């Protein structure tokens, strides 16, 4: 069938893990372990496609993030996740978006930008900030929670009609 590779990326902490989780096993983490380089695989039907949905959750600790390029390089499609309450992890999404374009040698890489946590109410990131960063970068920003499910489906589904529009 069809096989999407995505990949996940984005500042530690943001809820990378938990979004990817909350996808493919349907239940929210509520611990904080760091990630160093995960995958996930899945079969889904989308817009009546059967897909294979090939996962790869990726490290935002400096510490665990070795070689994220080299699974980065695989990636037809990306995740760029902040959460809405970590302005700095809004701040650094451009340093994502820069490996990402490295990694691809292209600077046109399907990509969705993602506000996590917006079930949480220290808001410091406001939806226009981010809905203007998105179309700075010519992509979709959807807001999720990976603790109550709110748009994580979108999300995901969202980045494979992105690189279908590729
Ligand atoms: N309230 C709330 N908490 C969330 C949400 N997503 C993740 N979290 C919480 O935030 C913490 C970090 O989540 P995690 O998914 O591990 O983050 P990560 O981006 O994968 N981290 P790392 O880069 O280190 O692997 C966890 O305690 C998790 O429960 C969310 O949407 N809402
Ligand atoms: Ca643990
Ligand atoms: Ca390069
Ligand atoms: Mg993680
Ligand atoms: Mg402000």
Same mark, same amino acid.
């Given at each position: 069938?069809?096989?999407?590779?995505?990949?996940?990326?984005?500042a530690?902490?943001?809820?990378? &893990? #938990?979004?990817?989780?909350?996808?493919?096993?349907?239940?929210?983490?509520?611990?904080?372990? =760091?990630?160093?380089?995960? &995958?996930?695989?899945?079969?889904?039907?989308?817009?009546?496609?059967?897909?294979?949905?090939?996962? /790869?959750?990726? #490290?935002?600790?400096?510490?665990?993030? #070795?070689?994220?390029?080299?699974?980065?390089?695989?990636?037809?499609?990306? /995740?760029? *996740?902040?959460?809405?309450?970590?302005?700095? &992890?809004?701040?650094?999404?451009?340093?994502?978006?820069e490996?990402?374009?490295? +990694?691809?040698?292209?600077?046109? *890489?399907?990509?969705?930008?993602?506000?996590?946590?917006?079930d949480? #109410?220290?808001?410091?990131?406001?939806?226009?900030?981010?809905?203007?960063?998105?179309? &700075?970068?010519?992509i =979709?920003?959807?807001?999720?929670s990976?603790?109550?499910?709110?748009? +994580?489906?979108?999300?995901?589904?969202?980045?494979?009609?992105?690189?279908?529009?590729?």
């Amino acid at each position: 069938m069809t096989e999407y590779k995505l990949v996940v990326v984005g500042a530690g902490g943001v809820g990378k &893990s #938990a979004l990817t989780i909350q996808l493919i096993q349907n239940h929210f983490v509520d611990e904080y372990d =760091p990630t160093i380089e995960d &995958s996930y695989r899945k079969q889904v039907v989308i817009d009546g496609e059967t897909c294979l949905l090939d996962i /790869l959750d990726t #490290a935002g600790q400096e510490e665990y993030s #070795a070689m994220r390029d080299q699974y980065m390089r695989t990636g037809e499609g990306f /995740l760029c *996740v902040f959460a809405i309450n970590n302005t700095k &992890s809004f701040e650094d999404i451009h340093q994502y978006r820069e490996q990402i374009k490295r +990694v691809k040698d292209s600077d046109d *890489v399907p990509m969705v930008l993602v506000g996590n946590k917006c079930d949480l #109410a220290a808001r410091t990131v406001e939806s226009r900030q981010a809905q203007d960063l998105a179309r &700075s970068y010519g992509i =979709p920003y959807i807001e999720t929670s990976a603790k109550t499910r709110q748009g +994580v489906e979108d999300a995901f589904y969202t980045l494979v009609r992105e690189i279908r529009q590729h």
